[PDB]
Design a protein around this ligand. Structure first.
Ligand SMILES: *[C@@H]1O[C@H](CO)[C@@H](O)[C@H](O)[C@H]1NC(C)=O
Ligand SMILES: *[C@@H]1O[C@H](CO)[C@@H](O)[C@H](O)[C@H]1NC(C)=O
Ligand SMILES: *[C@@H]1O[C@H](CO)[C@@H](O)[C@H](O)[C@H]1NC(C)=O
Ligand SMILES: *[C@@H]1O[C@H](CO)[C@@H](O)[C@H](O)[C@H]1NC(C)=O
Ligand SMILES: *[C@@H]1O[C@H](CO)[C@@H](O)[C@H](O)[C@H]1NC(C)=O
Ligand SMILES: *[C@@H]1O[C@H](CO)[C@@H](O)[C@H](O)[C@H]1NC(C)=O
Ligand SMILES: *[C@@H]1O[C@H](CO)[C@@H](O)[C@H](O)[C@H]1NC(C)=O
Ligand SMILES: *[C@@H]1O[C@H](CO)[C@@H](O)[C@H](O)[C@H]1NC(C)=O
Ligand SMILES: *[C@@H]1O[C@H](CO)[C@@H](O)[C@H](O)[C@H]1NC(C)=O
Ligand SMILES: *[C@@H]1O[C@H](CO)[C@@H](O)[C@H](O)[C@H]1NC(C)=O
Ligand SMILES: *[C@@H]1O[C@H](CO)[C@@H](O)[C@H](O)[C@H]1NC(C)=O
Ligand SMILES: *[C@@H]1O[C@H](CO)[C@@H](O)[C@H](O)[C@H]1NC(C)=O
Lengths: 414, 204, 369, 99, 49
């Protein structure tokens, strides 16, 4: 009160000083429940993979990704992610996602990094200098290697220019290395642009074959058919909470409700656009969202020159939600409820008033309108004054304000 | 040829419950008492958006095509009902200029006394569809009394549209305009009457 | 309740303190207006079981304790015919059950004791004799009441019956009170709907702005919402300060009609309803007061010949309180506001000079009793 | 930076002049009432109930006060009531007399 | 009558409409004032010749 009125001494009255507000007890986050996870794991379990000179863009769309199940896991012979912290990948959204994918030798997996040099990067599949995405690789010497060498896996090494980012070139056509025209056949000055790995089970761990997915991304003007994963939480009723349903955020009290929602209706509004009910996407009940209780805190005080005793009114708040005493003005605290009515000393509302009285304390009471009087009326009785009193009655009326003039230029610009 | 639309062709503009209340809203809607085109197929412009209705239960109206080319030079929106389910695709089809019954690809989706009514619009990379079905007592010409059309799907198709065509007793075609409507909601959360604010001075 | 916004709103200083202080001025004034109209009696007078008022029937305007709260039949008709974003509505100090005790007290004083309860302690007087004084106050001689008391009571009882039929069948008189409810509802609806307006910002929702943008851009985008929403409150508070001055002019008028029409018999022409004022009765209504003004309206005119004075023994006679009239053959003096002819006498009249001076004097015998 | 301060200081000043105009209309309504009490209570004798204080009005005296006026309303208040039987008329030679 | 300006003014919401409504309140009240002063007579009384 003293701070609200900017004074160390406060005279008798009722003063509004701040607002009370019921606090959020927890957060509720009802996305649609976790469904249609992107099929990255189905690609990781595929029976075979592309030769790297002829790598495959396996499409991912219309699904929710999760990279956290990946970056937490030791389940790969190599794992990398780029452009952002792995934690940030689960916030991303794209028109499409891809498993840009191939077989390579183990020593070449480290070439797959943003803008970096290497035979795979510069001639087979190039990352941009600030690439956001992940590289996932696992040993396949049990399937991709063969006795006498498996020659079906090859990488490009010789070309007239290095790849631009995501540039692709599957051509097996002869590399001409001199003046001799090659006529579509191998020979002197006329060499193969590819090198085969020739994979064998006896080769050392860096020359063994590895199956690879590069998680690789595309946002166009078309909608983001892929995003990182939705959260989920439990749900609870008759308590103030922070909440989200889909993307409908708020702070409120969730309650059971009878609003006759049609199947497609997500939420309901009042006359003033106030959203006040929702359909829970994780269990199809209808919840009425009541506001979290708030109201003006008023402090009821005698003159501080007489006592530091005070009482508090929480305007419109039930005492269940804040001596203590409920009134139709709201919950009243620190005042005694007295059944004898009196003239109104300090007003409160809806017939209640308060005062500081006898040892003394604040009391609150229903106010008294005046003394009751049965007038002695009947069809033949009259009363006549036998005397009089002259009375002098003061009445005070204001007539003038203080005459003020302001120089607006000196006030505004000094 | 043309016929009066009366109060037809109003749909839920947002997926929201409203109770015993009037709400004023601006979007593409079929104007009240508009001259809708009447048919017994041609290729038609899409304009801002389409209302379609027919007297049907035989599935001779198999569905529609929407696009720019309507042909295999680029992606084209195909809607077909096979009398078991609806199937929808956006591929570069090269099917007939006038099909009839025997009696790259970037997206795919799977779902007379009767009057069947529908609304279509495309916005920013999503395709919106709304529909309703009702009995009618009248022979031909649309019912004067009100009923609302309910949202089906919000298909993330990415493509734009400029034309459409029907796939083979009457069918009716209307075009939406950017309009303000006052929509009347009943106690049970449903639209039940409306005012087209640009129709006449009383409506205004 | 967004902390990012609240730090910016501190840069505007005292504006929120003076907006709350202005609306607190409005709020106290509504209780003081209600106090000045109804609370004009120091004592809660009440009416005896012997309802014996000369044939007048006040049962439609007095309380009946069988009703929901102590309202009269007509106060129940009046109570039927009138009908959260940091905004709060406060209760009045006096409840409708307390206003109904004051209108009951004012009415019980008025019936049992006339104007006397406004001047001092209530003095009882029989109701037919109070109406005799109120007839005498409009210049009609009091015998014109007593010789017509059953007629006057039946016309009054019939007229109160018509007030019930009127209030049961049309709302249009209460358009004044309904307009005062509608304006406050429309102002609050408009104040709430302005939360949805962009004011040139990227969005109307604070979390939406904060989520999309660099903090320094978001601050510049939020200062638009703060400017628009602060201009929205200053618009509303200015409308309420003007609307409270309009209502206060009507509360001062109602407090004056309480004092002058109910607690008295004010002679101010067409202040307390049309016709000559006899008395009026207050009834409570939602956010207002209703006065049932009871008035004497003259009827059934007759044309008469008339003269300013009459000659006698050369003396010119003038009427002492009445007016001279003739039925065509004989001359009489009547009171002015009701035809009651008397023979002209040396004590119905006074003399001033002789027949020479007055324009239009006439000749007839003044009787000397 | 100055256009932000001009905007704020001007809005501060417009809000003040707006509320001083409304407060001046409130004080004019009070000065019209005071001029009316001067004319009707001091210069006259009012039969308007409660206008010149409680009781039947006799006269009033104006006294000045800073920014206002004070009226000392002198009123007759009736006191010590006896109560009596009464009648509207009295019957003599078969004729009704009224006071 | 600029469209480019009028589309910006809509973003201020009810600030335009409530001023047209306020000045309409002023305007109708002038006829109420003139009625209450002069229309106190129920008939057009006329002096004799
Ligand atoms: C997922 O949500 C749907 C719709 O609310 C519900 O029917 C289903 O039981 C939920 N499934 C699980 C596993 O929580
Ligand atoms: C406080 O109380 C004392 C008691 O003697 C009194 O003299 C004084 O006028 C009061 N008010 C202030 C402002 O001190
Ligand atoms: C306050 O809360 C309690 C909770 O049980 C409820 O019974 C009561 O009706 C509420 N209102 C009042 C005025 O007490
Ligand atoms: C006051 O009155 C209430 C009923 O209105 C009663 O319950 C309560 O016991 C009373 N208290 C005292 C101290 O008389
Ligand atoms: C006078 O009034 C008193 C109080 O009601 C009553 O007791 C008394 O009988 C009355 N006397 C007469 C003569 O009216
Ligand atoms: C009238 O009242 C006064 C006091 O106001 C008293 O002195 C006087 O004696 C009284 N006269 C009668 C006749 O009662
Ligand atoms: C347009 O509408 C009116 C009223 O529905 C109708 O009379 C008229 O024939 C229609 N004209 C055309 C060209 O459709
Ligand atoms: C609203 O819904 C209830 C559900 O029991 C139904 O009985 C009622 O008939 C419906 N109201 C209307 C007007 O259709
Ligand atoms: C009085 O006399 C005139 C004579 O022309 C006549 O018109 C009028 O109807 C008569 N009655 C009244 C009530 O004026
Ligand atoms: C006028 O009045 C007297 C007494 O009432 C009566 O004798 C006379 O006949 C009346 N004249 C007319 C014309 O009515
Ligand atoms: C009364 O009026 C008529 C004209 O209307 C006139 O002739 C007559 O002289 C007037 N009476 C007197 C007393 O002059
Ligand atoms: C009244 O009587 C006198 C004579 O006493 C006469 O001169 C005069 O003309 C008479 N006036 C009228 C209006 O008859």
């Amino acid at each position: 009160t003293k701070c609200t009125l900017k004074s160390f001494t406060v005279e008798k009255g009722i003063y509004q000083t701040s607002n009370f507000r019921v606090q959020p007890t927890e957060s509720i986050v009802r996305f649609p429940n976790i469904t249609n996870l992107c099929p990255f794991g189905e690609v990781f379990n595929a029976t075979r993979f592309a030769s790297v000179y002829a790598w495959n863009r396996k499409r991912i769309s219309n699904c929710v990704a999760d990279y956290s199940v990946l970056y937490n896991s030791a389940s790969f012979s190599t794992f990398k992610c780029y452009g952002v912290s792995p934690t940030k990948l689960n916030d991303l959204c794209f028109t499409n996602v891809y498993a840009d994918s191939f077989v390579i030798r183990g020593d070449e997996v480290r070439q797959i990094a943003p803008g970096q040099t290497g035979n795979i990067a510069d001639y087979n599949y190039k990352l941009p200098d600030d690439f956001t995405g992940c590289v996932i690789a696992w040993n396949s010497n049990n399937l991709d290697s063969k006795v006498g060498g498996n020659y079906n896996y090859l990488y490009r090494l010789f070309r007239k220019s290095n790849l631009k980012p995501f540039e692709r070139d599957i051509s097996t056509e002869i590399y001409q290395a001199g003046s001799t025209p090659c006529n579509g056949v191998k020979g002197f000055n006329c060499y193969f642009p590819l090198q085969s790995y020739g994979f064998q089970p006896t080769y050392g761990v860096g020359y063994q074959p590895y199956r690879v997915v590069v998680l690789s991304f595309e946002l166009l003007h078309a909608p983001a058919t892929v995003c990182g994963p939705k959260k989920s939480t439990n749900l609870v009723k008759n308590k103030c909470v922070n909440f989200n349903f889909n993307g409908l955020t708020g702070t409120g009290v969730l309650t059971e409700s009878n609003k006759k929602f049609l199947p497609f209706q997500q939420f309901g509004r009042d006359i003033a656009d106030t959203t006040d009910a929702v359909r829970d996407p994780q269990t199809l009940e209808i919840l009425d969202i009541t506001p979290c209780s708030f109201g003006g805190v008023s402090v009821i005080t005698p003159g501080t020159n007489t006592s530091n005793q005070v009482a508090v009114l929480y305007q419109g708040v039930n005492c269940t939600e804040v001596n203590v005493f409920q009134t139709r003005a709201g919950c009243l605290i620190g005042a005694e409820h007295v059944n004898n009515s009196y003239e109104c000393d300090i007003p409160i509302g809806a017939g209640i008033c308060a005062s500081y009285q006898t040892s003394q304390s604040i009391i609150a009471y229903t106010m008294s309108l005046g003394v009751e009087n049965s007038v002695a009326y009947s069809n033949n009785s009259i009363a006549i004054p036998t005397n009089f009193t002259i009375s002098v009655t003061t009445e005070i009326l204001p007539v003038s304000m203080t005459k003020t003039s302001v120089d607006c230029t000196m006030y505004i610009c000094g | 040829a043309y016929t009066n639309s009366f109060t037809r062709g109003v749909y839920y503009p947002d997926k929201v419950f409203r109770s015993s209340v009037l709400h004023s809203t601006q979007d593409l809607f079929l104007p009240f008492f508009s001259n809708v085109t009447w048919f017994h197929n041609p290729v038609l412009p899409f304009n801002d958006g389409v209302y379609f209705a027919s007297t049907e239960k035989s599935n001779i109206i198999r569905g529609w095509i929407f696009g720019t080319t309507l042909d295999s030079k680029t992606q084209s929106l195909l809607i077909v009902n096979n009398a078991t389910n609806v199937v929808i695709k956006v591929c570069e089809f090269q099917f007939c200029n006038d099909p009839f019954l025997g009696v790259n690809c970037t997206f795919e989706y799977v779902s007379f006394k009767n009057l069947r009514e529908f609304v279509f619009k495309n916005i920013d990379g999503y395709f919106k569809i709304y529909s309703k079905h009702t009995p009618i007592n009248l022979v031909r010409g649309l019912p004067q009394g009100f009923s609302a059309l309910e949202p089906l799907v919000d298909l993330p198709i990415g493509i734009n549209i400029t034309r459409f065509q029907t796939l083979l007793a009457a069918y009716y075609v209307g075009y939406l305009q950017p309009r303000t409507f006052l929509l009347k909601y009943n106690e049970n959360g449903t639209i039940t009457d409306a005012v087209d604010c640009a129709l006449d001075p009383l409506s205004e | 309740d967004s902390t990012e916004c609240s730090n910016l709103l501190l840069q505007y200083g005292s504006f929120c303190t003076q907006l709350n202080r202005a609306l607190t001025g409005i709020a106290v004034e509504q209780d003081k207006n209600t106090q000045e109209v109804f609370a004009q009696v120091k004592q809660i007078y009440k009416t005896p079981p012997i309802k014996d008022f000369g044939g007048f029937n006040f049962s439609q305007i007095l309380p009946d304790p069988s009703k929901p709260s102590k309202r009269s039949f007509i106060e129940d008709l009046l109570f039927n015919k009138v009908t959260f974003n940091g905004l709060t509505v406060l209760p009045p100090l006096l409840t409708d059950e307390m206003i109904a005790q004051y209108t009951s007290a004012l009415l019980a004083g008025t019936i049992t004791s006339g104007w006397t309860f406004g001047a001092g302690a209530a003095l009882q007087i029989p109701f037919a004799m109070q109406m005799a004084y109120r007839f005498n106050g409009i210049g009609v001689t009091q015998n014109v009441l007593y010789e017509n008391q059953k007629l006057i009571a039946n016309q009054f009882n019939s007229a109160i019956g018509k007030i019930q039929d009127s209030l049961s069948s049309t709302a249009s008189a209460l358009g004044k009170l309904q307009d005062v409810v509608n304006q406050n509802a429309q102002a609050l609806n408009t104040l709430v709907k302005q939360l949805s307006s962009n004011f040139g910002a990227i969005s109307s929702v604070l979390n939406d702005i904060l989520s999309r943008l660099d903090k320094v851009e978001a601050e510049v985008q939020i200062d638009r919402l703060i400017t628009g929403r602060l201009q929205s409150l200053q618009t509303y508070v200015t409308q309420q300060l003007i609307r409270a001055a309009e209502i206060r002019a009507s509360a001062n008028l109602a407090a004056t009609k309480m004092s002058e029409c109910v607690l008295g018999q004010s002679k101010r022409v067409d202040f307390c309803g049309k016709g000559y004022h006899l008395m009026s009765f207050p009834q409570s209504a939602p956010h207002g007061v209703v006065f049932l003004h009871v008035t004497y309206v003259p009827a059934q005119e007759k044309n008469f010949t008339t003269a300013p004075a009459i000659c006698h023994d050369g003396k010119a006679h003038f009427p002492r309180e009445g007016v001279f009239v003739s039925n065509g053959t004989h001359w009489f003096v009547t009171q002015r506001n009701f035809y009651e002819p008397q023979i002209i006498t040396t004590d119905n009249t006074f003399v001033s000079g002789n027949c020479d001076v007055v324009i239009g004097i006439v000749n007839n015998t003044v009787y000397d009793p």
